[PDB]
Design a binder for this molecule. Sequence first.
Ligand SMILES: CCCCCCCCCCCCCCCCCC(=O)OC[C@H](COP(=O)([O-])OCC[N+](C)(C)C)OC(=O)CCCCCCCCCCCCCCCCC
Lengths: 101, 38, 494, 81, 255, 75, 61, 85, 78, 39, 74
Amino acid sequence: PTPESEAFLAKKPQVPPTFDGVDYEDNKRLKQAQDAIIREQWVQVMMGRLVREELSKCYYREGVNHLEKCGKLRERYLQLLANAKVKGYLFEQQNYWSKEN
Amino acid sequence: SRVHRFLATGLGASMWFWIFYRAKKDGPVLLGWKHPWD
Amino acid sequence: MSLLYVLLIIPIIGIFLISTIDSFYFFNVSYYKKIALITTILNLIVSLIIYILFDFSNNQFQFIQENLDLSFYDIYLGVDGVSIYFVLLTTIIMPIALVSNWNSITNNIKSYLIIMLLLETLLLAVFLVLDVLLFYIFFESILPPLFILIGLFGSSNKVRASFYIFLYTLLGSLFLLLSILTMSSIVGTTYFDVLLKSSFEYTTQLFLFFGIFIAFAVKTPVWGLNSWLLRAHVESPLGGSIVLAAIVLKLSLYGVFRLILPILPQASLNLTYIVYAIGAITVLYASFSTLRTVDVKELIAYSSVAHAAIYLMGVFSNTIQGLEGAILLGLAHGFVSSGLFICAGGILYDRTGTRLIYFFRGLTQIMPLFSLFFFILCLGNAGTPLTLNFVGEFMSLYGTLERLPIAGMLASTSIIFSAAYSIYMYNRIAFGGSVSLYFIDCFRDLTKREFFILFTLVSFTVILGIYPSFVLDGLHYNISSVVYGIEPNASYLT
Amino acid sequence: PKIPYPKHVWSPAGGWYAQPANWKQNTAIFGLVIFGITAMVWKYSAEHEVRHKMPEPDRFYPSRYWVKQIKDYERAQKEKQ
Amino acid sequence: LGAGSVIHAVADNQDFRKFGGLISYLPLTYSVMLIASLSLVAFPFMTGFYSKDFILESAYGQFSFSGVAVYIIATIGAIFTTLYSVKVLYLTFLSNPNGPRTYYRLAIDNFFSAQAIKSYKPAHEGDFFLTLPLVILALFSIFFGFITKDIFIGLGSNFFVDNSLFIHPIHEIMIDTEFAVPVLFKLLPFIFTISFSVIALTLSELLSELVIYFKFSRFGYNIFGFFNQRFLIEFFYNKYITNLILNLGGQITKI
Amino acid sequence: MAGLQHYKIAMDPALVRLGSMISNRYKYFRWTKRTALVSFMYVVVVPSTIGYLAYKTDGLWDLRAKRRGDLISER
Amino acid sequence: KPNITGFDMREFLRHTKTPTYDPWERHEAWRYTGRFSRFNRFKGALPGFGIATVAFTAYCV
Amino acid sequence: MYLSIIILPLLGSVVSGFFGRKVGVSGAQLITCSSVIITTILSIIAFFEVGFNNIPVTINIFRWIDSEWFIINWGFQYDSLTVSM
Amino acid sequence: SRRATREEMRDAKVPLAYRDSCAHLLIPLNRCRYETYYLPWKCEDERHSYEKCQYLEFKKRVQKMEELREAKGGARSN
Amino acid sequence: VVKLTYPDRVSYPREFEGGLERELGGAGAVRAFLCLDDE
Amino acid sequence: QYDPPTGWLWGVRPGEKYQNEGWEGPFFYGFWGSLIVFAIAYAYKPDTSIQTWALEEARRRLEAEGILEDPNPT
Ligand SMILES: CCCCCCCCCCCCCCCCCC(=O)OC[C@H](COP(=O)([O-])OCC[N+](C)(C)C)OC(=O)CCCCCCCCCCCCCCCCC
């Protein structure tokens, strides 16, 4: 894997991207969570951007044959496009949800 | 002038000679008499 | 001392120097205008320094100063990405507005300079305060200087214009104040880092939305609440007009990002169709009346109404591109309306003494430099690509379309009608025959002063129209925080 | 004939029948400037272009003489057997 | 560009009603304008022949009602292309001079006594920069279509395999266009072109009163005006769209 | 006439008078059947129509990543 | 019914021809004479046709 | 060369327009016609490289508009249609 | 004479609309067009062969359609 | 008039082995005619 | 025949020269000078954009899947 850069680590979230068990009176801990949800959404979004870039190269590589040789990237990009979006932290900060409900 | 008339006449001659050439060669196929591979 | 306090302090120093230098040297008014201009340059230099140090992906407010001396009303200053560009717009516009009035202010020059310097401090404080009640205090503080600026330096109808802008803004603001006071009572303060964590209940949000919206629709302005602008933006001196349309219209837009998006998310989403009907109506009605407006400065003033409708619809889109496009359009409008007001209220008006379109025709023949900048500005007003105006209009319009398609489709018709009134006004003034037979004297072309304020404004719109990343890169992370919603397989991770 | 016009109007494109006495000298400088910028653009293009198929050795493909991607491929392909 | 040569030659007049003659005055202009016109009417083995005529038989080659209908529609359009193509060349060059003396007055025939060195302006051709592009474009108008059809049409040509153009196989008609189209409908444009040209050329310079009889009929007068006024679209656009918007703005500003 | 001296302009009195009528026309508006009908149409009817249409189609459609075998409709 | 003015539309077309005598005849005569006769005008309607025909015949042998 | 086709007509245009007083009538015509003719030759060469050898050329310089999912570059693609046009 | 498999049609970059039975004759022609720069006097034999077989297959489908034409009492199919 | 008199198709639709299904994008995309219903 | 290029730039008549109104110093040297300096300073500003940080993590995650090749395999 590509080594995590010195600049990258300076901004890596130290907390999981969640609001469960977060004391909202702890300013530092709440802003840490908000940053983790925001950063995670952007990563998923930037993942789609990289898949689109690969799909672009294969399309201009396979030409006529793109409808058959670019399906794997094609499927990946559509999955990311269907799921990844910068939605903010603020609905999840104000609304708790449970799986068992 | 004289060069203009020569230029005028040359292309007109070029056009009809070109048309006559393709009439003799591609004309039979165009009219449906003969298939290209015959 | 914080750099943000230095931003607010430099113009006050220049006010002090302007008002006292008569005791150390009849001082020439050139000296006064030199002091005020250098004062604005230093304020711009400080804002540039802040931006170089500013970090694009921090959700903590930057360049803040600890108080530890809490009182009832304490000025806390801080900056993030959603306010940093408005601070830059204010510090770039202010020197240009001073140079645009270098010769046309002939009496009461000390008073004019002190008002503009005080306006700089107050408008900057609006973008930098970290408390919602501090926002109202700075938003309303600019009214008395604006009342005096219009009344001391305005045109023939300055009294009616000064009263209109004061009473309209006050009336709308009083409904915002009641909304803010209700928030202050429920939460215990209006400090941003505390109120943004509060969760108002839905019915409270609805009645909070109304009252904040009434004020912001008076200040946008929406069509039907916009006669104060059609008066004040026209009767104002040229420097007043630039400040009023480039920065003062932007207050309601930056106000939406602090007062509605984080704390009234449910009311904002449930009422977007009312916002969009008003914004759609404003886009069509203002466009048609701009087409029939015969005062050149009133025509540029009315086109501001149509552009502000698009950033208002982009700000309620609840999408990243619509929100970023709204800020982009706000900024691009500031450069373009400044240039078109200079072209009309400063170049045509100074030369002819009239603002009626019927007297102008064929100016290109004798004023080629004016017609070149005037045309480029009219393409910016039409949102032509390679201007920052296209980037903002496209992103704002895309977000409005994706949020509510019928509202975006009507709002899109602005691409047809902004071109219509921009091209119509350009053709009638620069083209449309030989030089107007109403001109007895010939006219000189742009002076070096006029050239270099238009060139500077035209430079900003084109450079940012080609590389809008210079603003978007510092917008992305912070503007994420005002989006409301969730994806099903992305939310509630464990 | 030619239309009359004001001599006081200064226009960057020249005006009405504008040709300075030194127009060839000025045209030479600007053409030199145009060449210099174009060459810089040419250098950028020849380094940043991307292809996914390379030309065959016997075909007329003059870009093979300056484009970095093809030059590397041709140099590497010469190492055979 | 050939038209621009004419408009320069006769002092900026642009109305057919003031041309005529000029055939001996602008021989190079006439030749290239004739060459271009035969390409426009898809005369056989000209450059325009290889493109337009294939479009027509391709419309038939897609054996569908819409495809057959457009074929007939575009055939009538081809008829009137020939008509106004004849109208241009004849009214500019082949007809009698409907313009004044100045266009055709030559120094060879003595007309002036003291103003003989100058003052003739006989409507001559243009210079090298005016005429060189005409010669070049004339050559493209004759051979370029033949030289290049195999690229653009071919039959299984693979010029666009980078997927620049995508044709789904279910949308292929070219096989039926090459083999299934009857020969009568393939040469029908040329039969129409070679005949309405005779019909147009005979109606002028030989008849010339029949069209006049049509014009001065109420039926013909109305037909002439309707088509000269471009289906009245500019009239109806200006009335009910442009002026509608201006009056909306008038109401908004005033009431 | 307005601060700085401007160039000599043949200020046409008719055009100036037309400009004065436009600035003062608000002083002479009256409620009539025509003005009330026009004002009601522009201020109430058309905006409420767009408002009703925006209301009824809010959330109706989404285009994002919609494939064949799916619907643009969400509601 | 005949008009108050003596303009008949049918007679207008009957007089739409070249007049036997015209007071302007000699002024307009140049528009149909030698250079602008039927033959001279249409003599070069197909500029290079003769040269092409001769060359084609020599080629066909 | 592929970028040089794009910028060469623009370069001549700014000299003809914004420095017409410097080059005059003849200088303006020499620079524009020269800058268009040279571009045309490079276009003919491009038509052979891209169309006849079926080698498309991609070129991206700097991003234009970058917002989350939209990344639009100042970018150019040469394919068979491009050189045909 | 043997029909080209879908792999070589895919490998030869045959146009998708012509990846039919006769595509085995399209590859030599499209190769020749590449070599001769598509000039319409150089690939004659390959051009006529691909056209002829394509004509032959066309002549088989019109017979197939004519049989279908009588199967419905001469009714319309387009 | 055209609707009353326009000729019937004079050739059976061209068929493709496999319908070019894989090279047209698989079953998720549109394919070519292959031993399907007549037309 | 062509004419000599004429015209008064900034309206300065050929006899005289441009007179400074007093704004030129601060505007050209302060306003434009600072903007030019800031542009040079901006070339050396570190990238703190969310995109740059997020692209690097996205690349690693797509390296983890069978999408992107790993320069440092294991
Ligand atoms: C979109 C905003 C602008 C971005 C582009 C900024 C310009 C980039 C360079 C453009 C090409 C160079 C233009 C040269 C100027 C034309 C000649 C000239 O000097 O005019 C003075 C001329 C002087 O002409 P003159 O030299 O003949 O002088 C005598 C003529 N009179 C009688 C007028 C004095 O002024 C005019 O006559 C016309 C006035 C309008 C000028 C038109 C603007 C030209 C630039 C158009 C911008 C193109 C935008 C592209 C669209 C966006 C893409 C989506």
